[PDB]
Structure 1
């Protein structure tokens, strides 16, 4: 399965999705800079509308514990 095919379900907790992401990211072998680009970009983009909304409110500069606690009720 390709990294672009990794997406969050409509009922799937973000948490279970983030695990899937760094597992697939774990099978990507690209430069770190590209993998940083993938992190800030693709993760949020394939996140579900309800959490996506939430993550837009965190702004930039956000870290994984704060994202992970931010989308917990969703």
Structure 2
């Protein structure tokens, strides 16, 4: 179900982040899982432009940095 959280073509990155972590919270994701999801599925399900930017940023970007990049 986290799998179906995908950033909409005109959806601000911040709104997609809100929905992504809301879903993790409902699925009782541990902090460890949360860290992994942030570095993987959060990037993979971003929209084409944001996904591109996040991949350029690279793994180990913090959420703060991803949000800056895709604003």
TM-score bracket for this pair, using the shorter chain length? 0.7 to 0.9
Q: Deviations over 1:16-73 (max 9, x none)?
A: 000101100111124544443322211111100101111111112111111101100x
1:15 to 1:53, Cα distance in 2 relative to 1, 3 A: same
Q: What is the root-mean-square deviation of aligned Cα atoms in Å?
A: 1.4
Q: Which runs of no fewer than 5 residues in structure 1 stay unpaired?
A: none
Unaligned runs of 5+ in 2: none
- The number of aligned residues is 71
* Range with greater deviation from structure 2 (55-64 or 33-42): 33-42
Structure 1 runs (4+) deviating above 2 angstroms are 29-39
2:9 & 2:57 partners in 1: Cα distance? 20
| Cα distance between partner residues in 1 of 2:61 and 2:55 | 10
Larger Rg: 1
Q: With the length of structure 2 as denominator, give the TM-score of the two structures.
A: 0.85
Determine if the alignment matches structure 1 residue 69 to structure 2 residue 65.
no
- Say if 2:39 and 2:61, in contact at 8 Å, map to a contact too: no
